[PDB]
Amino acid sequence: MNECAFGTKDPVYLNYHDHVWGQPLYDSKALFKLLALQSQHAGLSWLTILKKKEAYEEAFYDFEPEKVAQMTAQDIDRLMTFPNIVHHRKKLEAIVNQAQGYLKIEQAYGSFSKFLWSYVNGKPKDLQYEHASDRITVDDTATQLSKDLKQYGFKFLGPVTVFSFLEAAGLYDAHLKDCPSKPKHN
């Protein structure tokens, strides 16, 4: 478990490793929320964004895309002094652009979940890692998904970030073979 969880001992981070990271997530709105939170990570510890999750929920309508998508510069202006979120204007604007892109995807394609899972043919890609040093941080699929999302107006979701999202959402299973949290795949 310890090796799989990147040597982190903070129990809030371990909780995320144990109960979220890499567990196949098929719900569209939950996938949107996780992707949006991932976009906020750059230059900070993930535990920073995790401890702030409830504050982000309060800032962004519980990440409900129809509601987030309607937000304007006036909202972002207010959110720049909203307590316990990161006050990075382009990061905050990005969440609104992402929600708009989600709605565009659902209009053009049907389901945001089906859109994303299409990139791994509807089931997790088990990366079959045995050592934490086996882990890559980007690949061709994440790069193309990043590019494709960008076309619908998503922001702050480059290739490495998208790769991290795929592992987080369980589209990729990056758990080590003997980790107690490695999901079963059929």
Q: Write down the least CB distance from residue 186 to Zn ion, Å.
A: 19
Q: Is 174 in the site for Zn ion (CB under 5 A)?
A: no
Q: Is 175 in the site for Zn ion (CB under 5 A)?
A: yes
Q: What are the two backbone dihedrals, phi and then psi, of residue 84, each rounded to the nearest 5 degrees?
A: 70, 15
Question: What pairs with residue 126 in β-bridges?
Answer: 173
Residue 105 or 179: which CB sits closer to Zn ion? Answer: 179
Instruction: Candidates 42-50, 55-63, 132-140, 176-184: pick the segment binding Zn ion (CB under 5 A).
Output: 176-184
Tokens of 93: 């604007």
Give the span between the Cα atoms of 87 and 4, in whole angstroms.
32
Instruction: Indicate which single residue of 4, 92, 96, 142 sits in contact with Zn ion (rule: CB under 5 A).
Output: 4
Q: Is 179 in the site for Zn ion (CB under 5 A)?
A: yes
Give the span between the Cα atoms of 36 and 38, in whole angstroms.
5
Fill in the per-residue mask, 123 to 162: x = in contact with Zn ion (CB under 5 A), - = not in contact: ----------------------------------------
Q: Is 168 in the site for Zn ion (CB under 5 A)?
A: no
Residue 52 or 175: which CB sits closer to Zn ion? Answer: 175
Instruction: Candidates 81-89, 129-137, 161-169, 175-183: pick the segment binding Zn ion (CB under 5 A).
Output: 175-183
Q: What Cα–Cα distance (Å) separates residue 164 from each residue in 40, 127, 169? A: 12, 13, 9
Full DSSP string of 37-75: HHHT-TTS-HHHHHHTHHHHHHHTGGG-HHHHTT--HHH
Instruction: Indicate which single residue of 157, 181, 184, 186 sits in contact with Zn ion (rule: CB under 5 A).
Output: 181
Question: What pairs with residue 173 in β-bridges?
Answer: 126
Site for Zn ion, rule CB under 5 A: 4, 175, 179, 181
